[PDB]
Structures are given as C-alpha cells and as structure tokens.
Amino acid sequence: SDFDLIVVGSGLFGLTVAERAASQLGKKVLIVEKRSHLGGNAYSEAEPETGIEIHKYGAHLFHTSNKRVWDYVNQFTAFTGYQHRVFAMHNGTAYQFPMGLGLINQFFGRYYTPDEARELIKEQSAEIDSKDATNLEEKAISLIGRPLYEAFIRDYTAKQWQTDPKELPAGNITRLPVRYNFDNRYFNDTYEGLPVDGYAQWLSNMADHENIEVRLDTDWFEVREDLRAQNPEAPVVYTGPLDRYFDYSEGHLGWRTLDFETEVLNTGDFQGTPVMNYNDAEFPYTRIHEFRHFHPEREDRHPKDKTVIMKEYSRFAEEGDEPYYPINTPSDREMLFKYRELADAETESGKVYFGGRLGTYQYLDMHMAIASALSMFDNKLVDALK
Amino acid sequence: SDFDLIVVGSGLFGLTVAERAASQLGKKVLIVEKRSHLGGNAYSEAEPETGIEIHKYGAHLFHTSNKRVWDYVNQFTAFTGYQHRVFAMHNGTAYQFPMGLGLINQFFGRYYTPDEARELIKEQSAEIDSKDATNLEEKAISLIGRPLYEAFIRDYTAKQWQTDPKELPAGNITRLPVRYNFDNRYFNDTYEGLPVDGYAQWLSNMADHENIEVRLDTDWFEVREDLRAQNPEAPVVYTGPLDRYFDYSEGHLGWRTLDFETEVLNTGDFQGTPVMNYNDAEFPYTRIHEFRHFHPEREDRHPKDKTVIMKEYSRFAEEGDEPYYPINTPSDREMLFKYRELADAETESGKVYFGGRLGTYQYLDMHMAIASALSMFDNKLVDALK
Ligand SMILES: Cc1cc2nc3c(=O)[nH]c(=O)nc-3n(C[C@H](O)[C@H](O)[C@H](O)COP(=O)(O)OP(=O)(O)OC[C@H]3O[C@@H](n4cnc5c(N)ncnc54)[C@H](O)[C@@H]3O)c2cc1C
Ligand SMILES: Cc1cc2nc3c(=O)[nH]c(=O)nc-3n(C[C@H](O)[C@H](O)[C@H](O)COP(=O)(O)OP(=O)(O)OC[C@H]3O[C@@H](n4cnc5c(N)ncnc54)[C@H](O)[C@@H]3O)c2cc1C
Ligand SMILES: O=c1ccn([C@@H]2O[C@H](COP(=O)(O)OP(=O)(O)O[C@H]3O[C@H](CO)[C@H](O)[C@H](O)[C@H]3O)[C@@H](O)[C@H]2O)c(=O)[nH]1
Ligand SMILES: O=c1ccn([C@@H]2O[C@H](COP(=O)(O)OP(=O)(O)O[C@H]3O[C@H](CO)[C@H](O)[C@H](O)[C@H]3O)[C@@H](O)[C@H]2O)c(=O)[nH]1
Ligand code: NA
Numbered sequence: 054s055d056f057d058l059i060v061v062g063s064g065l066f067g068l069t070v071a072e073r074a075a076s077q078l079g080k081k082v083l084i085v086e087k088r089s090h091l092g093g094n095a096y097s098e099a100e101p102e103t104g105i106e107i108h109k110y111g112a113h114l115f116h117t118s119n120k121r122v123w124d125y126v127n128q129f130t131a132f133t134g135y136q137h138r139v140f141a142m143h144n145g146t147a148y149q150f151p152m153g154l155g156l157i158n159q160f161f162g163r164y165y166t167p168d169e170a171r172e173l174i175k176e177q178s179a180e181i182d183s184k185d186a187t188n189l190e191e192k193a194i195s196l197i198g199r200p201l202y203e204a205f206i207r208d209y210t211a212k213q214w215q216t217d218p219k220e221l222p223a224g225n226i227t228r229l230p231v232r233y234n235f236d237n238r239y240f241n242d243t244y245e246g247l248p249v250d251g252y253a254q255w256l257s258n259m260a261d262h263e264n265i266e267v268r269l270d271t272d273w274f275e276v277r278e279d280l281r282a283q284n285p286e287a288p289v290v291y292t293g294p295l296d297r298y299f300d301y302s303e304g305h306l307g308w309r310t311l312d313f314e315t316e317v318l319n320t321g322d323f324q325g326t327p328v329m330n331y332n333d334a335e336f337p338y339t340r341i342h343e344f345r346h347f348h349p350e351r352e353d354r355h356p357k358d359k360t361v362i363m364k365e366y367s368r369f370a371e372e373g374d375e376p377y378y379p380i381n382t383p384s385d386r387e388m389l390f391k392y393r394e395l396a397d398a399e400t401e402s403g404k405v406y407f408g409g410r411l412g413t414y415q416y417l418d419m420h421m422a423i424a425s426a427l428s429m430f431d432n433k434l435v436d437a438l439k
Numbered sequence: 440s441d442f443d444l445i446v447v448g449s450g451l452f453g454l455t456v457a458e459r460a461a462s463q464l465g466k467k468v469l470i471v472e473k474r475s476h477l478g479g480n481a482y483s484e485a486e487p488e489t490g491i492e493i494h495k496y497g498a499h500l501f502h503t504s505n506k507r508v509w510d511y512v513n514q515f516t517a518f519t520g521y522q523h524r525v526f527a528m529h530n531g532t533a534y535q536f537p538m539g540l541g542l543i544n545q546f547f548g549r550y551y552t553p554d555e556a557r558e559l560i561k562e563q564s565a566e567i568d569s570k571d572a573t574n575l576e577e578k579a580i581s582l583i584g585r586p587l588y589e590a591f592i593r594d595y596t597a598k599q600w601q602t603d604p605k606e607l608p609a610g611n612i613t614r615l616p617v618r619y620n621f622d623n624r625y626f627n628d629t630y631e632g633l634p635v636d637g638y639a640q641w642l643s644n645m646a647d648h649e650n651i652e653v654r655l656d657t658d659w660f661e662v663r664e665d666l667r668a669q670n671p672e673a674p675v676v677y678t679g680p681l682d683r684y685f686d687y688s689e690g691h692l693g694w695r696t697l698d699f700e701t702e703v704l705n706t707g708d709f710q711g712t713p714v715m716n717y718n719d720a721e722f723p724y725t726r727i728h729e730f731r732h733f734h735p736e737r738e739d740r741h742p743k744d745k746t747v748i749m750k751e752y753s754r755f756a757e758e759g760d761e762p763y764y765p766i767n768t769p770s771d772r773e774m775l776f777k778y779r780e781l782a783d784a785e786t787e788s789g790k791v792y793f794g795g796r797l798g799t800y801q802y803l804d805m806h807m808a809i810a811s812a813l814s815m816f817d818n819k820l821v822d823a824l825k
C-alpha cells in the first residue's frame with residue numbers, strides 16, 4: 054500500500070510516532086498537517102530583518118532527566134550547552150530568580166546565610182499553616198510569607214490566569230519555591246540545551262526518512278474519508294483537538310491562549326538576558342523574551358545594532374485563538390472524562406489512537422510528549438501494525 | 440638503559456612532557472618528585488572527617504579555548520559540566536560578580552539597561568583618562584569610576600598584593616572590567632569543567648604508563664650525580680626553581696605566597712556557593728572557598744551536616760613558604776634575564792631543559808603549562824631524544 058499508518062499532526066508527539074514506525078518497523082507513514090510547516094508549536098523560524106531565530110508559538114526550552122528521551126533526540130540534532138536562567142523585574146529592580154539567597158539578599162536588604170535564610174522563611178511564613186490554606190494566595194503565604202508573595206507571585210499569577218489568586222486552588226502550589234543557596238539554574242533536569250541549528254531543522258530531520266510522506270496545509274477532517282478508503286486497515290494516530298474530533302458533542306473544552314507582540318529594536322541589546330519576568334501589575338505582559346540571547350554562540354551572524362524582542366500576554370482562548378494550556382475546571386474535567394470514553398470506543402471500532410497535547414487535553418513539555426509517543430509506539434502501535 | 444629521559448617535578452608541565460615521551464616516542468622516563476605525591480600544586484585529596492575533595496595548594500579551576508589541550512586532557516580524565524561563578528561580599532551584601540548589569544543594579548540601586556549602563560560607566564569614569572593614569576588606582580578609576588573602584592577593587596587588591604594600589608603599575612589593568620549584560624560566567628573560555636574523579640586521579644592517570652617510573656620523596660639535587668652517571672646521554676627536563684638550580688648566584692627571585700586556613704563546620708552549607716570574595720579591608724582573607732559546591736554531583740556522598748571551608752590569605756613568600764606567584768619587580772626581571780642566559784648555557788652543555796612555573800619564573804594556568812610542555816616536546820625533545 055502507499056501508506057501503512059496515518060499520523061494527524063506533526064508536533065513532537067506525531068513526529069516521534071511516525072519516525073519510530075518508519076525506522077523501527079519499516080512501515081510507510083503518511084503525516085497530515087494542517088499548518089504550512091512541520092513541528093507544531095515547537096517550530097521556529099528566522100525573523101526576516103535580522104535573521105535571528107524566533108518563535109511564533111512560545112519560546113521553547115529543552116530539558117529532561119529521561120535518558121532514553123535524551124539519547125533519542127540527539128539522533129536528530131545536536132544541542133548547545135545553553136542553560137536557562139530567568140530574572141524578575143519588580144519595582145524597578147531586576148532580581149535574581151527563582152527565589153534563593155540572591156533574591157533574598159536583594160529584597161530583604163542584606164546577606165543571609167543558608168541557615169539564616171531558612172530561619173527567615175520560617176518567620177515570614179509562620180502566619181498560615183499550609184494544612185489550613187483554602188486557596189492559592191493562602192497556600193503561597195503559608196510557604197514563603199506575605200512580602201515575598203506580594204512582590205513576586207501575586208500579580209504575575211493574576212496576569213497569567215486572569216483571576217484573583219484568592220480564587221485559585223491551594224493545590225496549584227505543591228512545594229517550597231525557595232532555594233537556600235545561590236544556584237539560579239532555572240531548570241533542575243540532568244540534560245538541557247537548545248538545538249544547534251534551530252528547532253525547524255531538528256523537527257524536519259525527524260520527518261526526513263525514506264518511509265515518511267508529509268502533506269502540509271491539509272486538514273484531516275477534509276481528507277480523511279478519501280485517505281482511509283485507499284487503505285482501510287491502516288491505523289490512525291490523531292493528535293488534533295479531542296473535542297473537535299467528536300463534533301463538540303459533549304461541549305467545548307476550555308483553554309488559555311497567549312498573544313505575542315514581537316518587535317525589532319534599533320539596539321544590539323535590549324535587556325542583556327534571554328527572559329525578563331515582569332512581576333508588577335502595571336505591566337500588562339508577563340515577560341519579555343530577547344531571542345538573540347538564546348543563541349550566544351551565533352553572535353557573529355546576529356546584527357550588531359538590532360535585536361528582536363517579544364512581549365507575552367495571557368488570556369482565555371476564544372474562537373480563532375490558538376489553544377495552548379488546558380484550563381481544567383471541574384466542568385472541563387467531566388466533559389474530558391466523557392470524551393475519553395468516546396475516544397476509547399473509537400480506538401476499538403476505527404483503529405484511531407489519541408495522543409499529544411490536543412488529543413488528550415493535557416499540557417506536555419517536549420520531552421514528555423516524546424516519552425508519551427514512545428510509550429504509545431511500544432505498547433499499542435507495534436501490535437496494531439503487525 | 441633503565442631510563443632515556445629524566446623529568447624533575449611532577450606538576451602538569453612535567454607530567455605532560457613525561458607522558459608524551461613515554462607514549463609518542465616509546466621512551467623510558469624517570470620522574471623525580473620532591474613531595475610525597477604527584478601533580479604539583481594541582482593535586483587534591485579527601486578531607487579525612489568529611490570525605491570532601493579539597494586542595495592544599497589553592498583551588499584549581501580548569502578552563503581553556505585551546506582545543507588541542509582540551510582533547511589531550513580528556514584522554515586522562517572526563518570533566519564535569521561545572522561552570523565557575525563568583526560572588527563579592529561588600530558591606531554586608533553578596534553582589535553578583537564580575538561587574539555587570541547585576542552588580543550595577545544592586546550597587547546603584549535600580550535596573551540599568553545595557554545602553555544605560557554604558558552611559559553610567561562613561562559618566563562615572565569621566566574623571567581620569569586612561570592615557571593619563573600613572574598607577575593602578577588611577578587606571579582603575581579611569582575605567583570604572585571611584586564608587587565601583589573603592590567598593591570592589593581597592594581593598595581586595597591591597598590585601599592580595601600587600602601594597603597600596605597607588606603604588607602599583609597602571610599596566611596591571613588592561614581592559615574594561617565591566618560587562619553590559621547579565622552574564623556572570625566567571626571564565627570566558629570555550630571549554631571548562633572539573634575532573635570527574637578529582638585531580639589526584641587525573642594526574643595519577645597521566646603518569647600511569649608502562650614506560651614511566653615515578654620516584655616520590657626525592658630531591659633532584661640530592662640524587663642527580665648518581666642518576667646521570669647511570670646514563671649520561673639522557674636529557675633532563677627540570678621544572679624546579681630556576682634560581683635555586685644555579686645556587687642563587689644571581690640573587691633570590693621574589694615570590695608571593697598564600698596561607699590557607701581550612702575548617703570543618705557543623706553545618707551542611709556555609710555560604711551556598713563555591714567561592715565568596717571578601718572585598719572589604721576589615722576581613723583579613725581575600726576569599727572563602729566551600730569545597731563541596733565544586734562537586735554538586737557528589738551530594739549524596741557528602742555529609743548532610745558538615746562542610747569544609749577555607750580562608751585564603753596573601754603575603755610575601757619568606758624562607759620556608761611555598762612560592763606561588765612571581766612578583767616581577769624590575770629587580771626580579773633583571774636577575775631573571777641573567778638566569779635565562781645561565782639556563783640556555785646549561786641546555787647546551789648539559790642537555791638540561793628548563794620549563795614550568797618554577798623553572799621559568801612565570802605563573803602558568805594548567806592549560807598554559809600543558810601547552811608549553813607540548814611545545815617543548817614538539818620543538819626540542821623529539822630531536823634531543825633521537
Ligand atoms: C506557549 C508554549 C510554550 C511551550 N514551551 C515549551 C518549553 O519551553 N519546553 C518544552 O519542553 N515544551 C514546551 N511547550 C510544549 C511543546 O510545544 C510540545 O512539543 C507540545 O506540547 C507537544 O505536544 P504535541 O506534539 O501533541 O502538540 P502540537 O505541538 O500542538 O502539535 C499538534 C499538531 O497537530 C496539528 N493539527 C491539529 N489539528 C489538525 C488537523 N485537523 N489536521 C491536521 N493537523 C492538525 C497542529 O497544526 C500541530 O502542528 C510549549 C508549548 C506552548 C504552547
Ligand atoms: C595558588 C594556586 C592556584 C592555582 N589555581 C589554578 C586554577 O584555578 N586554574 C589553573 O588552570 N591553574 C591554576 N594554578 C596553576 C597550576 O598549579 C598549574 O598546574 C601549575 O602552575 C603548572 O606549572 P608546573 O607544572 O611547572 O608547576 P608545579 O605544579 O609547581 O609542579 C612543580 C613540581 O616540581 C616539584 N619539584 C620542585 N623542586 C624539585 C626538586 N628539587 N626535585 C624534585 N621535584 C621538585 C614540586 O614539588 C612540584 O610537584 C594555580 C596555581 C597556584 C599556585
Ligand atoms: O515570576 C514568577 C514566575 C512564576 N510564578 C508562578 O509560577 C507559575 C508558573 O510559572 P511560569 O508559567 O512562568 O513558568 P514554568 O516554570 O511553569 O514553565 C516555563 O517553562 C516551560 C518549559 O518547561 C514553558 O516554557 C513555560 O511556558 C514556561 O512558563 C505562575 O503561574 C505563577 O503562579 C510566579 O508567581 N512568579
Ligand atoms: O573581587 C575582586 C576580584 C579581583 N580583583 C582584581 O583582579 C585581580 C586578580 O583577581 P583574582 O586573583 O582574584 O582572580 P583571577 O581572575 O586573576 O584568577 C583566578 O583564577 C585562576 C584560574 O585561572 C586562579 O584560580 C587564581 O588563583 C584565581 O584568582 C586582583 O588582584 C584585583 O586587582 C578585584 O579587584 N576584586
Ligand atoms: Na506556614
């Protein structure tokens with residue numbers, strides 16, 4: 054046949070399943086992708102004026118402690134030694150971040166030793182017991198105290214969720230967000246970096262196999278009857294929206310979206326660091342990205358007098374907005390449970406498997422999407438394709 | 440013969456020359472070492488109470504942009520992904536360091552953009568032109584201004600050199616010590632890390648070759664007549680003190696030394712970072728090292744409730760002191776020039792080559808010692824050993 058497997062969507066989940074079927078099982082795979090490019094939201098491209106690598110669907114930082122995933126992705130791209138670090142802008146000062154001895158010195162005005170800082174946090178957070186917290190605000194204060202909460206958490210959280218933190222669940226915070234040393238590595242994972250030749254090249258490499266066919270600008274729902282008629286026995290791995298697949302018969306799942314305002318500035322360096330959080334309510338955006346600083350190894354191909362920045366805004370996703378993060382209200386959780394039963398039936402009757410962020414209503418980092426695809430391949434697809 | 444080459448001293452210079460003769464030329468090499476261990480000042484050992492890897496002759500950080508040197512040392516040890524970072528303690532606050540947007544925000548009280556910081560430094564340093572500076576103090580001020588100089592440079596410099604900075608040469612500062620971004624990587628080199636199993640294991644591996652014999656607790660000057668009588672044609676590579684070799688016939692070269700005060704404390708974490716500079720005159724030491732933080736990958740073999748720290752003191756080297764850094768007064772420079780003529784004659788008549796820190800009166804980082812040994816091997820020893 055012309056294909057043995059159809060994959061809908063070319064994000065990291067779809068690419069991983071397609072590449073494994075192609076290279077491990079020697080199967081012909083057809084990838085159907087609605088957008089004009091591969092890679093889903095991880096995709097990046099050159100900004101035209103400067104040549105700088107930018108993102109249109111969020112900045113993407115790769116990090117994992119899963120060695121299988123790390124070994125896997127390194128088959129398709131090398132990674133730089135980039136280590137993500139973030140600074141937090143509050144009341145006109147850039148604070149070291151996350152909360153640690155650095156921020157603590159800057160905020161409380163003098164140096165605290167690790168043991169002194171532990172004692173300070175105990176004093177500050179004495180007010181509320183975490184076991185008695187009824188919402189996010191109280192849970193936060195029960196852990197780090199009011200001054201820290203009000204300076205670095207309250208307004209940022211309010212902007213991101215478009216909600217008062219008093220109206221968020223205490224379950225959103227599950228551990229002490231304070232380090233008692235000077236370590237300001239943002240991520241805690243064993244492996245970390247950025248694709249040496251960019252995300253577009255990495256993701257294109259994953260799809261570059263003699264057994265893989267890619268059709269861009271193609272909506273599954275417009276071509277599916279034709280494609281399956283060519284080979285009715287071919288399973289489908291679907292990574293598009295779960296509720297849309299079933300014609301919203303159980304309602305519309307709720308998502309948050311993001312707006313990105315991207316500007317080219319006539320300076321070589323706007324903020325001297327890749328990411329600056331804006332923690333104060335007077336700034337409508339949550340953070341600014343300056344893309345050149347993600348790849349300092351490319352400095353002699355970047356312009357000396359221009360830079361690309363991007364301001365990020367958060368809000369509820371309306372019709373026509375890119376859905377990025379599941380909201381997960383109890384209402385959402387229950388129509389999700391209904392959709393899972395519909396999906397499970399569809400797998401049984403139609404050999405259509407459901408995966409990825411959109412297909413399962415679940416936010417997945419890149420390495421988690423990859424791990425999830427590897428699992429579906431190992432535990433479902435090998436048998437379904439024999 | 441029992442040996443074809445004698446090497447005096449087992450620091451990185453001696454080890455490199457010995458290992459290259461041994462493995463590349465297949466020559467028998469005898470290494471003579473006065474101390475009870477290999478490795479010279481780079482040598483490290485476990486502190487007995489805690490097991491933590493410590494140094495007795497200064498903390499050693501490996502970094503280089505020389506790819507040949509990097510490829511070479513990786514034959515003998517793997518390196519961690521450690522990146523050196525330093526903080527500066529001034530008036531009760533730990534400042535981000537070296538001088539950059541971080542320190543500038545903390546010191547001048549609010550956030551400056553890269554371009555604003557460049558303008559601030561121009562204003563601050565307007566006082567003196569660098570072309571008009573007559574000493575270190577003026578040269579420093581001509582570059583970064585009085586407030587920064589007086590807070591972070593003056594007293595630290597005074598403690599290290601035991602001299603008023605007004606009495607030091609303007610030539611000690613040769614570039615702008617300010618970064619206009621948030622990058623606080625201490626070193627600027629392409630490659631960097633720490634030996635995975637410690638320095639003692641690395642340096643022992645370099646000497647571990649069927650063609651290498653090592654005699655510890657052996658002073659060259661006490662055994663040389665006997666050794667050379669066994670094989671008079673064997674060249675000698677000497678890395679001991681240059682002036683001592685010639686019986687101080689032209690005077691004593693002047694050196695700075697260091698005292699280290701090493702303590703085990705009953706806390707798991709003293710300062711939350713490997714190195715804290717103490718920039719104020721009220722502290723007699725220049726900096727404190729906390730050795731566990733050089734190897735965070737070993738945390739589950741380090742004690743949870745103890746830590747080893749070390750305070751570092753600088754002064755002139757007197758009889759019995761370890762000579763660490765050449766002072767290089769004009770008096771020193773001229774007896775050095777006299778000794779170079781004596782050494783050059785000794786190479787011609789006695790086949791004794793002079794190299795390394797002590798043998799050439801020159802401070803050498805590890806990678807520079809290695810590069811220098813590789814050069815002597817390539818350009819002198821291959822011919823001398825044929
Ligand atoms: C704002 C944002 C920031 C992120 N930052 C990071 C980060 O820093 N680090 C990290 O590890 N992860 C990050 N992620 C997650 C990252 O994008 C993952 O790779 C992604 O979640 C993987 O899930 P996926 O492959 O299912 O999804 P997607 O990337 O969404 O891919 C799904 C694909 O299916 C296509 N599709 C949908 N419907 C149809 C249809 N009907 N027919 C055909 N094709 C269709 C879509 O066009 C898309 O290309 C971020 C995600 C977002 C949204
Ligand atoms: C305080 C300090 C800190 C340092 N920190 C760093 C750092 O962070 N990074 C870095 O890259 N480098 C650092 N270095 C430099 C590092 O130690 C180099 O490896 C060294 O300078 C290399 O020169 P070498 O091999 O000639 O010297 P040495 O290490 O001094 O070795 C010379 C050897 O010769 C032996 N010897 C002397 N006289 C005799 C004799 N008569 N007979 C027999 N043996 C003899 C000595 O015992 C010694 O073992 C530091 C050095 C010091 C002193
Ligand atoms: O300055 C801050 C930062 C975070 N938060 C709290 O932490 C939550 C989550 O923080 P972020 O969304 O800003 O960041 P994450 O660590 O959760 O995840 C980040 O890293 C991910 C990669 O793994 C993606 O890139 C993602 O978009 C990016 O936000 C916020 O809602 C808020 O409650 C604050 O209060 N203040
Ligand atoms: O807080 C500081 C630090 C440095 N200096 C100035 O800079 C000079 C040199 O600084 P350091 O000796 O402290 O450090 P280096 O960068 O020169 O070298 C460091 O790294 C080396 C490895 O390459 C060795 O480990 C060495 O011992 C260690 O000091 C000082 O004399 C002083 O004039 C200051 O004024 N203030
Ligand atoms: Na509490």
Ligand code: NA
Binds near residue numbers: 564565568569580582
């Ligand atoms: Na000046």
